[PDB]
Structures are given as structure tokens and as C-alpha cells.
Amino acid sequence: KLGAGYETSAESWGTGRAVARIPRVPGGGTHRAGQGAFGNMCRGGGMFNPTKIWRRWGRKVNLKEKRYAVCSSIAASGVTSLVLARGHRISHLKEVPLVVSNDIESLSKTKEAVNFLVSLGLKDEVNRLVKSKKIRAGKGKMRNRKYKIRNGPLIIYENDNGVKKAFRNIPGVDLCKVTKLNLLKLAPGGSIGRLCIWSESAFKKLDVIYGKIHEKKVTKKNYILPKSIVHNPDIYRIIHSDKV
Amino acid sequence: VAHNNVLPNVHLHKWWQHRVRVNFSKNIKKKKRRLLREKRRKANGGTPIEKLHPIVHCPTQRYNFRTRLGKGFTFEELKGAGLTPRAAQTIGICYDKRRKNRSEESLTKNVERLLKYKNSLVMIPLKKNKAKKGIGGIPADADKNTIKEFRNKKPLLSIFKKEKNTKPFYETIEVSKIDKEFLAYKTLRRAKLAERRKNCRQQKKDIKFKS
Amino acid sequence: KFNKQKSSSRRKMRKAHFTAPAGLRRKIMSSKLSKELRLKYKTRSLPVRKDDEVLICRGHNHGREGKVVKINRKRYKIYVERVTREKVNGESTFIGIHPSNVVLTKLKVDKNRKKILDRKA
Amino acid sequence: ATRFKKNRKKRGHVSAGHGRVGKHRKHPGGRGKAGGLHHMRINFDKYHPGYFGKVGMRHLNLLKNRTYCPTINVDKLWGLLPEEKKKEFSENKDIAPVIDVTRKGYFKVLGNGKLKHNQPIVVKARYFSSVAEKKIKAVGGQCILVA
RNA sequence: GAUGUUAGGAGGGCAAAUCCGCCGAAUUUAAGCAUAUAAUUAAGCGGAAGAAAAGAAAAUAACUAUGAUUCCUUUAGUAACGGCGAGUGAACAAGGACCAGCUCAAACGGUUAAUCCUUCGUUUGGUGCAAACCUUUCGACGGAAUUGUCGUUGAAUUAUUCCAUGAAUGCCUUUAAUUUGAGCAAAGUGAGCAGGAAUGCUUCCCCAUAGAGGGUGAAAGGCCCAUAGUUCUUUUUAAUUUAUUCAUUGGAAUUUUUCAUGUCGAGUCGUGUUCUUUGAGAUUGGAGCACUAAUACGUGUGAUACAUUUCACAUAAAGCUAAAUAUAUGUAGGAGACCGAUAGCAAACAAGUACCGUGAGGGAAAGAUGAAAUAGUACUCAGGAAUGAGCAAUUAAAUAGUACCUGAAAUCGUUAAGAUGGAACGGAUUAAGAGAGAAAACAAGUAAAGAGGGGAAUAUUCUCUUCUUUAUUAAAAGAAACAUCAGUGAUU
RNA sequence: UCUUAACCCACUCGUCUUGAAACACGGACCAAGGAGUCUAGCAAAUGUGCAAGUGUAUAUGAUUCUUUAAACAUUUUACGCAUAAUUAAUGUAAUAUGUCCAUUGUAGAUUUGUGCCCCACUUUGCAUACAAUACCGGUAAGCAAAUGCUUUAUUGAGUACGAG
RNA sequence: AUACUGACGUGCAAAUCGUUCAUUUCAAUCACGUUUAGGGGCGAAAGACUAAUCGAAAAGCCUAUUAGCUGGUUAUUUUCGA
RNA sequence: GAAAAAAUUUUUUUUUAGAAUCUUUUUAUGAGUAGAAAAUCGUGGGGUUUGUGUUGAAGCGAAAUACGUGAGUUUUCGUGGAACAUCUCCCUAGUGCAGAUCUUGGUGGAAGUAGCAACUAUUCAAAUGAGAACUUUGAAGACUGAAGUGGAGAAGGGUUUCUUGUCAACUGUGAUUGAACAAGAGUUAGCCGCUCCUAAGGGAUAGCUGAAAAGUGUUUAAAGGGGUCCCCGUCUCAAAAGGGAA
RNA sequence: UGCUAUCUAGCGAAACCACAGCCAAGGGAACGGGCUUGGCAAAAUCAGCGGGGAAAGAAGACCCUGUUGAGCUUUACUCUAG
RNA sequence: GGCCUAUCGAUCCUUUAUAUUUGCAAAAUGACGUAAAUUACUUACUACUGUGCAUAUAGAGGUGUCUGAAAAGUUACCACA
RNA sequence: AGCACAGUCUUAACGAUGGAUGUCUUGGUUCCUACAGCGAUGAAGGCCGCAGCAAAAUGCGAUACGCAAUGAAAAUUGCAGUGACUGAAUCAUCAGAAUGCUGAAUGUAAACUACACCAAUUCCCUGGGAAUAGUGGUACUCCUACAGAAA
Q1: A162 DSSP assignment
Q2: C-alpha angle with apex D94: D89 to D100, nearest 5 degrees?
Q3: CB A112 within 8 A of CB A100
Q4: Using the beta-carbon criterion (under 8 Å), do B185 and D130 form an inter-chain contact?
Q5: In angstroms, how far is CA D37 from the centroid of its own chain?
Q6: Coil, strand, or helix at residue D109?
Q7: SS3 at position A34
Q8: Cα distance between residue C18 and residue C3, in whole Å
Q9: Nucleotide lying nearest to A229, CA to C1' measure
Q10: How far apart are CA B34 and CA B21, in angstroms?
Q11: Which residue numbers in chain C precede an interruption (C–N > 2.5 Å)?
Q12: Distance (Å, rounded) from C-alpha C45 to C-alpha C33?
């Protein structure tokens, strides 16, 4: 609050009064009289720098960097080792770029969605997601932060035919539409890669978006995939190689 | 103040805490404007809510080659189109008295623009099923069939937007048509030098004419 | 969840629970219906009434069926026939039961309830 | 942000990392730019040479539109075409490009650099340097003054 | 012009966050201070609204020109002002949001002020249960009004085309939204274990378009409210559907052709002079005083005083008007990487309360039993009474007993142990006591025979084991002691 | 581990101060609170993306609308800073067409060769340092009718294939 | 309210006590009502007094005024160090 | 990429390294205020990850053959009765105290001490009660000494009055007392006052000023009354001690 | 001689307080309770007392310092009602 | 410039010098000059083009507390750091 | 039925004292969203009241912790009472009805229940019969209308 702790009267008789010289509340009778006043050390006195409404709250993150972060995060999800490393129970999955026929986009009952995840072989992961809801420690409970859950698979879809409502309400699942792929969802907590489930339509559309066989509005205009600094990172093969 | 660093210059010296405002409202305010305007368009019987505007050339030296939406077609442009101001106003063509067509090209270009909009539009009969020729040069009413089929069609709003100037700088000329004896720089400086004397003569002509 | 109209913030909800008026309080003293009745009426849950017969299935009396004595909307407590207990001074009072801890069997119809049962149907 | 700050590194040390002996007092020279010409004169001489006093003609409203005029050197002129077009002109002698300097938003053409010897070029612009006219002419091109 | 308790009406005060007029400082900055600065701020006083103010060119430009107002983005820390110090500081364009225009006055209309208003009345409706509202034309009788209301917006006139119009019969359908209140609302109160009591642990079941939030005797998707989802009903306002006949009065727009070329805000603008104010500089705006104009070929702008003059752009000295735009106030919602009872609103409590001050005013402290007090201390004994005790007694728990959660430290009690010749503790090293401990600080395996657990082979063979016991062999580990080296020394 | 001992040692901490154990000041005790922050604008450092550009502004657009007050998107010259400087200023403005070549030195990294590896020759000649020339704006001086001229002086926060 | 520079001086009191003393028909004393208000009032004048507050009252605000000056200015190890 | 030991050639036991800000090894070196840096460590919250909880969480008290140079970290037993971590990585901050004559709340030694001293001074017996130097009663002895601790009254206080209870706290000793606490109760006017009148004066009306707020009080009044169309003529408050029906 | 002081019964504070409390000399910020060297040093207490504790009070009022003030004066500088 | 070693002064401002250098913000002011031209809103071509103010450059007017505030006393009535 | 010196100091266990710590949280907070003026038709504000047993806080206004009406709808309870078998008890809604004295406060006043002046006023009954010293009105300024006075 703007005036916080300063709406007492202000007075300072102290020199020669045989007390410390910091301000005292004036007047008499009541216990608040003669008592230590405003200041960053006294009962009700207000902390030294208040927090204003005008902290530099946000940040203007840069378009080209954001795009690169999205491309790179999706690419990271592509690599099997990284998803496993990110801690998914992904052991029995057939392939990490997991693409399913567009009938997945038309799924429309939660049980079938669970059943589908089990059929894929993510049973252990589905178990961890159901299991992992807990009440967390500390002040959060009073601020509407009661449960903590861990991050489930990310369903990527081309256009709704049930999926958006249908896979929601299974703990820790996320859904996002392909055109508006989201860096926070692809890369939670600054971790890299995620267990991703793609529609075939989505998969085909992804390639269109970044400009192989470009389009008038789907493709991001004037934008290219960032070229790598290193062309091939197999350092041990280079060292192994005969000439070297 | 200390060493190499530039001199300080911050004008927060007169009381400024009582004068900040921080816009957390950007996205929500944008959403609100959109929602009201969309609601208004929905309300207004499927009509566009945008009004026609003339294209104009920008003021002064700085933007002499650029062209933008102005405010208000002028009386000459309406008359050339075949409309009268109140009538124009009813069909969303916006008027003014202030503009005056200084040069020929701008008048022709604007009457073509008005005509294109006019030719495009199709008019609802005012009291339903009572279609008539109508006043002021406003396009005549239409039947049920045309209207019904047209309402079902998408209303293409391209005319409201600013005209793109098509770039044509990458252009070609034959070498043997080039005239190499010209001195452009010389002409320019001489013209600047001779300006006062030319003004002096022009002023004398202007005096002569007025009598 | 999805509507923004109803607040989901904890403090506010809690306040609402404690400061609730009597009609609202009557509504949230509702009980699970027994299976035969559930089948009969096609209804999950009912607001409790005095002359009905409940079965207790949570708390230290979970073997007990019995008739409802008094319902207390001030204290959020229903009281039942033989869940008697002696107090310190040798005086018998009834043990309070909260509605979740009872499953309602036989319920006595009257015109107000009949209207509710038809409304549910 | 806060966790990295310098004061936490020195956190228990009496001066707060700001000198025991002289201590950090409020406003220790006087405010802002005050000490100029007098007690901080040496700083003002040594870091902002020309600072004090007035010089030259006054101008009552600049009205900056009038005098606007971005420059380009001739050096960059062929670069305003794409690559494929440039090659085509290099191959075919009979035609030359016109370049309208207005469309790319420049007003005056200046004379840095070397043009390709014996490609004529027609240059349309508002302003030219003396040097630029001579160079454009030297390669067999023409200058057209245009508003 | 007075006068009237004449008839009908109005203003006063409260509320201020945003909003509009005034009036108006200083602390301060300049390392002093006097001009500047603080600041056209604060205080003072007047006035409005759901927003206000501003607004329909006496504008800017000098271009290929723009074109009411406001706001945003911007120009710009720039032009500029300034002990040219400190410091201060615009405008035009440009990109947007929004986008809306107008009427008095002046002119014109006298074979007739065509206006306006109170009071009395009078009727075509529609809603509503009623109350009541809401439409509706038509007359009186007063007044008011020529010291100027009303119409018209140069004037007729041609062709074209519209809009009000009034009567008859007919016809008010389907949908789409939008916004209120409304309902209805998925699966387990299944074993066993430990617990006072699961929502715990297993395990066997399930639902989810609901695994948001809350309640419930410990963490509950399936115990409950609610939630997702829909089904209605409410607000208005789109689209869609049907009009058809007949009727006359009146008005409007272009278009021809004529003829008329009219008007345009004065003690005001301006100027001098002052003072103020400003970005405004031989004056930016205001203001006082003195002087005091011109009629549209006028007179006002075109940021340096002037003359003699072009040219561009405008039409002052009268009025109104939606939008965007603002909101630390009041009230209602919704929120949170916010605070957690010495914090956070001063204020989680009977807080602007108690209390203090003659008064203006100043102005606190103080949340938590337990699942349940519909468990709040029964009974006996000793007590005058407080209280205490109990073989007695609520509770899972009273060393949870209404000072009721947890219960730190300072401080102080009881017992035990030690110390004790004018400070006390301490450091570095050992000692004697007093406690604690086996995880390195001995003993693998093997056999006998009990108790468990597993894994495999194709309910029973094989095989791996942990605990117990009897006894029965390893071995290693550290410390000693002497000896051998090697390294570093001393000695005779 | 604690506990006393014993030998030997051992001055009240904080503090301002040339110099504190001080006959300098502050400290009876204990518990909790209690002090280099935030914004604006600027700088260098370093990180990161892009690169003669760069930032997508305000704002629009989206089957984006619990989260989302964020994320996403932006039909082939808006604005900032950069891309050129200089002079009070009208303003003027970078070698120069003999050639897609890119001013001259002296050191100087990297490379080629000779007589897979040290040399010593040669060979290319970065960065950078030090100079030198040209040329551009201002000013001189000389001339002067002109697109002003000049081999000469000077001056600039100038330039000589970009760096932001 | 003079003297005792007496009592008290962590008081019986933020001016009290004892004894001594000045004053008493007038420039006399008291009550109550009434008048004058802060760079102001009032003053048989001490810068006295204006509610324990006076060489500029009390209250709140401008205001967290301002201070080249005093005090304070919070975990460890490691490196270089005036 | 195999080294050793143990058994009884064949079985068993130990180890078997490749983390680049990292591992092996070598050598040099090590003072520090003002100051700078790096590396750690800890607290509130966040995202991410994978866990502890009623066979008892956090907290707290005492510790521990515990680990760390150290900040600290870890753990045992006891208390406790409900939530707690995150070192995987990293965002974020009102983040770490002995001191400020710091603030707030509590608390000691000083200490059973200074002190409970004005106002002539009390004694005996009885009653009540658990208990009487200071409650009540009687008897003495005393003092105040009509400028009174006596009657009345004013201002201020405000139920303090009275009866009946009565003793949690207070009544600076004690206390059965009480101006405390509790329960009821009590104030009666034509004549006593206020109430009416005017005074020092106050507030308004007319004007006039002033942005207004206010400053003025007949200064250009068509103004409230009495007679019966004439004559008087600012309104209003201001005395509980002046005037004043009984 | 009264009343206090005193002892008892009863009741019951505070200022102050780095830690504390025997000296000589020495040195040392030049007058130490602690430090070095000497003298020396034996529980617990009771009543006085004023040698010392550079005793208490209280950000020296004297003096000086501040580009802190204020009251006051003038033929200080700048103003200003009248 | 004075035999050598001393003999002195920023910014703003004023003041007077200098120039074939410039400005006064939509324009003009020598000059309808010189040629033409026709009867006119004609075409070329000219270093030199009103008053006043301002700049640029160069001196000079002065700051002796001399690297530059326009500044007298008093307090035994006094305050505070 | 014996034995311990006391004091002072230290240590440990168990206590007092105290309320820190941790844990909670019907409160604050900030932002966002939304509407947004009350008054002579008597406001805000203040008093004064009002319960069977009742102090404040709350609520309400002489019909007084509530009346009516609508929607829920069987109990409400400390005692006492009052209620169903749905205008009865309880809520919610809240439009009807009611809203003391004041307060701009406006008949003159004000530390007053003081004081004027003009209407006497009100109710019942379907044009009569009863009540009650009770109840209204009466500020300043203004505007339109009207009135009878003046030039």
C-alpha cells in the first residue's frame, strides 16, 4: 500500500530526552504513544524499499530467438536419448517421433484415450502420472497451489474432432494446435524434450510450416531453419578417422 | 559525476512517482476492442462497418512519393462519380468540404475509386420487398433472389485497404537511347543560383496581371 | 472449472461454506441414498429429513442403523436414535454424525419431498 | 536477478563494501552536474571538451521534414538489384538497368568506391554529388534529376 | 419597479478517485544565494458527470500537398529556453485507435405570426393481477410573442426520381445469437492390516466432455456439495416470412432554363503600456489600464523588429455534438511466483473501538482446546474458603483443563555430581572421573536341526538365500616388541 | 563426548582513531524484527540471435480465449538506432575509369616451396603497431566570370571495401 | 514570596512544607459573564505572558523536508591487495 | 588388460579406473586492514524432476566413535500431532545480525533493600466472623474548638445516594470495611429556580465589498408593531450573583 | 526532647549495570580493577561512612567547526506595504 | 618588442574591426540591368541587391579571494549538527 | 534409626517463568473486470430509542433484532414460548406498507423539549356519528403565471 506504515503522526523529540533519537509517536495515554515510529526496524514501521507497482515485470524476448527455441525444442524431442533423459518411462515405446493415424484426432472418450496410451505401451508413464499428484509443502496451499503434478505426454493436433476436450482431464496431459506450437509447453522448466504424440496430419503440416513446399498463410514468412555451427558432431569418429 | 561516462540528463526531477502508469492491460484491452467491434458488425445486419476513404498523397518533402488513406472525398470527386453528399454519406462514402483537387491525376484516380465501390455495392430495399430506383444517384434497390444469394457470399473487404504502390525500379532501357551529354549537377546548382532573380521576375508578372 | 463466473479461490470458498444461510445449509446436509431406493428413484443423493432411517458407515458406530432424532443446521450435525453417550455428569446425550458418514435407507414421503422426487425423476 | 548482486558477496563487513574510513555519505559532491566550471572543472575539461557556452546562428523552428535526405554511395548501387538480374546485364551489353533511387528510400547519391568499368547505368535521383556525376558519366551512364 | 403564507415549479447540503474554474506557497535544487529552480505542484476556495474537457478551421503546410476533436505510437531529450549555470523544453508531418456532424445570428417570406406555453378538457392505443406506466388527435379559455416567435437557407422554373402520407382486407412465422436467473448432473463407502476415526497402506474393482475448488473424525475423481456437460426459461436484436388493394394531401433530391449575386458576430479585434505566464526568442497565452478598427479585392495566419508589396491557407470577436480516453473514490465481481499475526490495511478479535487531549486531533493492545464439549471436569476425602489429593473420572491424548496448539531463550526452583585463598570463563597439551557407544575396532565358510523366505526346471524335483541355535576349522586387522633396509640426523 | 584439574599462555568486544586493555565513546539480559534497493536513462564488460542491417512499435489477425493478463501469427519504403562526414550557415560531401581491380611502407600471425620431423633460406604479408600518401567538410593563402579553380598550408568527434 | 541559600529534593508537590516576612479602604482583592489570536494578541515592559509549550503557541500537512556531519551498516573458505 | 590371496592341479575371496572446470603426477609457493574477485553455504517462494508422512511430518530439547578446513550438513533418543522435502537442473527474492543511547515484547542483579515520618494519641471490655491494632457496640481518655473534618450552597463530577447482599481483583498494612463488586430501589413545586427583560457584548437582515471563503452591521431599505385610512418602528440571542407577579 | 534511623511482623519500588571489583611500581593514548614484576591473598556475613570506582543525570550550554539556523541592527546587498 | 630571469585574466555579455563568407524559415527590395521580343503572366542572360537584428572570425571592456559568487554587523535571549 | 557445613560458582536431569519458533488463517493486499450520485418526495451525518428474560457489536425505527408479499420451506430453541401434517416456525428475496427526534434543516430559537402566528384537526359510518391541544402550514433567493396598488 502506497502510504504503508507512515500514517501515524510524525515527531522526533529525542536529543536530550534520554532515549534513542529515531521518531516516536506523539500524544499520550495509549500504549502506542511514545513508541517507536516509522522506519525499517520498528513495529508497523514499513520496510526500507517498498515494492512498487512498476518493477520491470516482463521481458521483450526476440522473435528470431523464439522461433529458433521452438524449432530446436521440437528437434530435441525428436532425439530418443533426450526424452528418456528428461525422465519419461518411455522404455517400451516403439519410436520417439511417434506419429499416429488421424483417427486419433477423432477420439472422444477419456477411457479410450487411456486405453490408447496403454496400447502404445506408455503404461508405466500413465501410472506415474496418475500416481504423482501430491500436496506440496509450504505457504502455497493458501494461494491456490494445492497439488503438484508432473508433466505427461504432449498431444499435437491439426484440427479438433474430439481430442481437445477428450484427452484433457487425464493428469498432466497437454494439448496444443500445430500452427501455434508453444515454447513453454514443448520445454517445461527449461528442460529439453518431451514425450510427444503427433497426428499424421500434424506431422505432414509441420514440414509445410517451415517451408518445404511453402504456402500463403500456413508457412512462416521469410523464415528459415537456423544452420548449425558444427556440421557433424561425431568428434570420436573424426579422431578415429585415418587421416587425422 | 565521474570520469568518461556521458553527462547525466534524467528529467525525473519534478515529482514523478505520482505520475507513473504501467499498462498490464495490453492484451485484455486489445481483446475488448475486437469483441465490441465484432459485436457491432454482427448487430448491423451483415453490412460492413468500415467506411470508404479517398487515397491521398502525403504532405511535404519527406513522404512525397508515398500515399495513404485521407479523410473525406471532396465535392468534385462525388460529382464526377455521380453522387451528392448526403446520399453518399448514407452509403458510407465519407465527405468533406476541406479538400480541393489541386491536380488532375488525383481527381481522376479518386473518381475511379468511388465508381469501383459504387459498382460493387448492392442495396437492401428500405421497407422490404418494395424495391425502387431511389435518389441522389444511390444505386437502385434489388429483388429477394439476388440479396439472398449475395448474403450467402463472403463480403470481400479489399477496397477499404490502402493501395499498394507497385515497385517498378528494376527496369530496363537500351544503351543506344542514353543521352550522355547532359550535366545534371550543373543544371541543379545553376537553378539554385538563379532562383532569386526568377522570383523577382515572377513577382513582377504577378503585379502586372492583377491590375 | 472452465467458467470464470464462479470463483475457485480457496479462501473465498471457505468463507462461503462458513457464512452460508439456512436454506443453503439445508441443501448441503445431503446424504447418499441406499441401493434399493437409488434403483427406485433414479437419484444419487437427497437432503435429509427427520423421520428417515439411516445406516452409519464411517466413524466409531459403523455397525449402526437407526432413526434420525434431530438435525442441527447450526452445527452441521444430525443426531440418531441409539448413538447415545453418557456425559461427565452422568447425563445422556446423542453423538453427532456428519451426513457423509451415513447412508440413507427408508425415507418418509410427504408432499414437499414428493415434489422433489418427481423433480429428480 | 537479486541473488547475484555484489552486496551479498560482502554481506558482513561493516562498510557494505563501500569504505570504512571515509564512509559513503549522502550526495557527496553536491547534486548532478553542479561542480562544472568550479570544483569538478577538471573532469568537465577532461571528459566533455566543448561543453560550455553558445555558438552559431539560431533557428526558430527547424521543421525537420524540409531538410530530410538520406544518402547512398555509388559503391552500393548495383547491390540494390538482386544477383540474377545483375549477371544478366553483365552478359548483355545492349541494355542497361535504370535505377530509381527513390523507391529504395534514398535521396542523395555520393561518390565512394569503384563502379564496374563499361557497364553503363541510368541513375534516377533527387540529388547528386559532383563526383557522382563524373563517375556515372565516366562509365557511360546518365544522371536524370527527378522529383 | 415594488408588494403578495397568491398558482405551479427550481436552487442550498453531503460525496471526490478520475473531472472542470480559480487562488496559490515553501521546504528544495544550484554543493552559498538573490534570477532561475522546486511548480502553472501542495495547501485554500468554487463546480460537474458515468466519464468530463474538446470539437467541426481566423489549422498546418510550402508538398504530387493535407484537412473537426480526443487518445495511443512518435517526432524528442530535438527546435528552443536558461546566472545560456543548475536545469528545463515544444510543434508539424508519419504509423494507428476511433472515425460524425452540425444551428443560431445574418439574408429571404406580410391579401395577414404560419409560433410558443399554463389551465380545462377530449380519444386511437398497448402493456399489467392490480398499482400503474406507455403510446394517441382534438378542441376550448387564458396568456406569452412584432423591442421578433416561426418557416426558409439566394430566387423561381423544367424534366426525372423519391419520401412522409390515410383506409380496407391479410399477417407477427421459423431460426440464429446475446444476457439473466433456472434445473438436471458419471463410478466403490469392496476385502485384509495397523489406528479413537480414513480420505492411510495394500489389493480387487470402476468413471471421466467431471483428476477445478471446497466440505467430511489424517492426503478422497468414485462419501457430500459443487465441477464437466446439457436441458429449459429471462434480457435484446439480428436474420429469415406476406403483404395486397384503393386514397388524397404535404414534403425532398438531382436535373434544365432563367435572374440574384446577396451575408458573414465592436469598447470586439488590434496597438501601446504594464504585470503575469510560457518553448515563444525586439513577447506564447492570459490579464489590467490607455488608445481604439476595417467590411470580404475586407482582416486574420504564414514562430526576428520594420517599411513598400506578392502569394499560399483561412474566415475571429455567438452555440451544440457520439466515439475512442481517464479512474489511489464508492460498490460489486474475478486474481496472484504477494503478506502470514512484532507481517500484511493503523485494524484477521465488539477498530477508528478502548484510551489520551480544553481543542484542532492523537489513537492502541488483543487470532489458534479437542474429532466431538449434544465429551468442558461427575464422585469421595482434607479444607471456613480458595484449593489440593484420590483406590474415584471425560478423552486416543488432560504434563490438551478453558492462563487451553507447539512451547525456544533470558530468568528462577529440586536433586545429584563437581569446584571453591582478592574476578569469571578461555587457548594449546595431557589427566582423573563420569557418561555413551561396536557402523573398522577378530573368526569367512563347513556340519548338525529349528524357523522362515525366494528363484528355476517339467503340484514336486532342483537350486539360491536370511534369521535362530549347537561345535568347528579359517583367516585378516590394529597396536606392541625386537630385527633388517632406506632417508634424515646426533654422537665417540 | 562431557568434567574438573595441572604446566604454560591469555587485558572488554564493537568503534571512530597517527595511536584503545584504557581515566575515549556504545553495550544490564534475552527473544523476534532490523539497513546498498527499485525504476528511469547511459556505459563498459560478457553472454545470446541475426548481420548492411536490425528491433515488430502502436496495432491488427487468429475455431487464442481455466491456465492465456501468454503463446502464436503479420499479402512483393511507418518509426528508432545503424548505414557518412562536416561546417555558424545557404549547405557541400570520400582515390577514379586508367580495372570485380580492393593507396605505399617497415615490422608482423598463417601458408607454399627448397636444400613425416627441428633448422636456415626462400614464399605469401593477417591482426596490429608505427608511419606515409591520396581525398572529403571547415578555414587559410594564391587566383578569380563559375559545375568555382590551385602543385600549397592547415583543421575535423573525417575517409581510404563496412559493423551494427 | 523577603529571609532561612532552613525541610524535601528516587519529593507529601514536574515548585510542596515549616519558621520568618510583605500586604489590608485602595493605582485594593475575588467571582462570573464578556472582549482581543500567532510574526498575531496582550504587556505599570521581564522578550514577560498567550492551558507544565514562547527571542515567535499548540495541531496536522507540504514531508520519508534537507544535512560535505555522528552512529550503525548481517554466512564461510580462497586469492590478489592500497 | 588380469593382479593377488585363500582353500582342497580344481574350486572360493578381493578388486578390475577413462567424469576434460576431469584423472594421474611433478615442482614452486602460502602475512594482511581499506579494497577487489572467485569458489562455496544457508533462508521464503517458483518451474522441473522423485521422494518422506499417523508403524507419526515439520517444529522443538538433549545429544552423536557422524562428515566437512569451515559456513554447515547428517543422524540417535526424547518431545510433538500434521504435513514435509528436492543437491536433477534452474528461475526468483522484503534472504543470513551482537552491537544502531536500534524497535517491540519479556526478564534479572541491584533487593526482601530504599522505604511505608506531615496533620498532638489512644486504651479496656463485648459482639460479628475461618481469622479483628485499624468492622460494630459499650466504657474511658483525648482532639477539632464556630476563620471547624459543623450546617448550607456554587462550578466540576455523575448515580458517587439508600437498603439488601457481599469479598475474584482493588481498597499501597490487615479488612468481616468501603466512595470496590452484585442485586434491587430513590429525585414529586402555580409560590424555590430556570423559564421573561435588558447590560458588557454576540449572531444575522439592508447595502457594499470580496474568485469564493469571508469582512463589515444602515453606510442609496418600498422592512416589524400600535391606533381605526392614520401613528409608532432593525430583528434576534447574551445574567442559575443585575431587574424580576406569588 | 519529639519524630526518623534500628529489630521484628506486614508490605515493598528505582536509578544504575562491557565484564567486573586489594594494592605498589612500571610501562602504555603520557593518572590502570584486569597487563609485567613485586607486595601479597582464607568462608559467610552486620552497622556506619564518603577515599576511589577519572560514580549517576545528558549527544557541553564555554571554545572552535558547518558554505545548518534563528532573534536582533544598520548610511550590508536585493526588495516591499505605506 | 625591451641582454636573460618578473610585469598578469575563462564562459556569457557588450563593444568595434574583417569577408567576392552567411541567415532572418512561402516570397520579394541592385534593376525590368543587359540583349532580344510583342504588345504578353514573353524568352535568355548577369560574383557584386532595402532598413534593423543575428552569426562566423579578430581584438578590446574584468573578474588581484588573481582556473573568475553581485554580499555588512550582532547575540551575555539564543538553537542544532 | 543414622549420615551430610553453609554460602558462592559450574554441570546434568526434571520442573517453573515466558511466548519465541514451527504449523495453521471466515483477514489484509495489489492488479484485472464491471458499473456508479444522493438530497426540501427531507440526504449524508448525529442523537434518541426499540427484545419476555438483552450490554456492546449487529439489525431495525413507536407496526422497532422486524410487518406484508413473493421463493425456498419443518422446525425454532440458553430457558420460556411459538409451530407443520403448507400465505403459520425458519431462511432467502424484497418491489407493498411503515420509516421517532433531529441534521442543508427552511416559522423564531438553542448548552433550552423555550417561543410565535394562521388553519381547530382527525377518525368511523353511507349524508350522518364519534374522537382528540392533537395535527398540518408559515425560511432565504429565484423563475413562469396572476393579482390589486404607481406613470
Answers
A1: S
A2: 55
A3: no
A4: yes
A5: 31
A6: strand
A7: coil
A8: 23
A9: F49
A10: 23
A11: none
A12: 5
C-alpha grid cell, residue B64: 512525397
Nearest residue of A to residue C14 by CA position? Answer: A142
- Distance, in Å, from the CA atom of B146 to the CA atom of B150, rounded to the nearest integer, reads 6
- In the beta sheet, which residues pair with residue C97? C78
Which residues in 16-35 of chain D line strand G, with CB less than 7 A from it?
16, 18, 20-21, 23-28, 30
In angstroms, the CA D121 to CA D139 distance is 8
CA D30 to chain centre: 36
CA distance B166 to D103: 10
CA-based nearest residue in chain D for residue B2: D43
Cell numbers for C5, please give them: 463466473
Which residue in the set B4, B173, B187 is minimally distant from D96, CB to CB? B173
Of the candidates C44, C43, C102, C26, the one whose C-alpha atom is nearest the C-alpha of residue C68 is C102
Resolution at which this structure was determined, Å: 6.7
Q: What is D18-84 written as a DSSP string? A: S-TTT---SSTT-STTTTTTTTTHHHHHHH-TT-SS--S---S---TTTT---EEEGGGGGGGS-HH
B113 in helix, strand or coil? helix
Q: Identify which of C75, C73, C69 has the alpha carbon closest to the alpha carbon of residue C93.
A: C69
Asked if A58 is an interface residue toward chain B (Cβ–Cβ < 8 A), one would say no
Locus of grid cell 502404445: A120
- Amino acid present at B175: V
Query: Looking at this protein, which amino acid is placed at residue D48?
Result: H
Strand order in the sheet with A196-199: A98-100, A196-199, A154-157, A174-177
Question: CA torsion sign, A207 to A211 to A217 to A221?
Answer: positive
Neighbours of chain C (3+ CB pairs under 8 A): A
Contact criterion met (CB below 8 Å) for B106 and B121: no
Q: Distance (Å, rounded) from C-alpha A198 to C-alpha A158?
A: 9
User: What is the DSSP secondary-structure string of A170-195?
Assistant: STT-EEEEGGG--HHHHSGGG-----
Alpha helices by DSSP H, listed for chain C, are 10-19, 22-27, 35-41, 111-120
Closest CA to D146 of D100, D96, D81: D100
Neighbouring residues of D9: CB distance < 8 A, sequence distance ≥ 6? D17
- Grid coordinates belonging to D81: 538489384
Sign of the CA dihedral with A182 first, then A185, A186, and A192 last: positive
Determined by which method?
cryo-EM
Cβ–Cβ under 8 Å, residues D99 and D124: yes
- Phi, psi of C10, deg, nearest 5: -60, -50
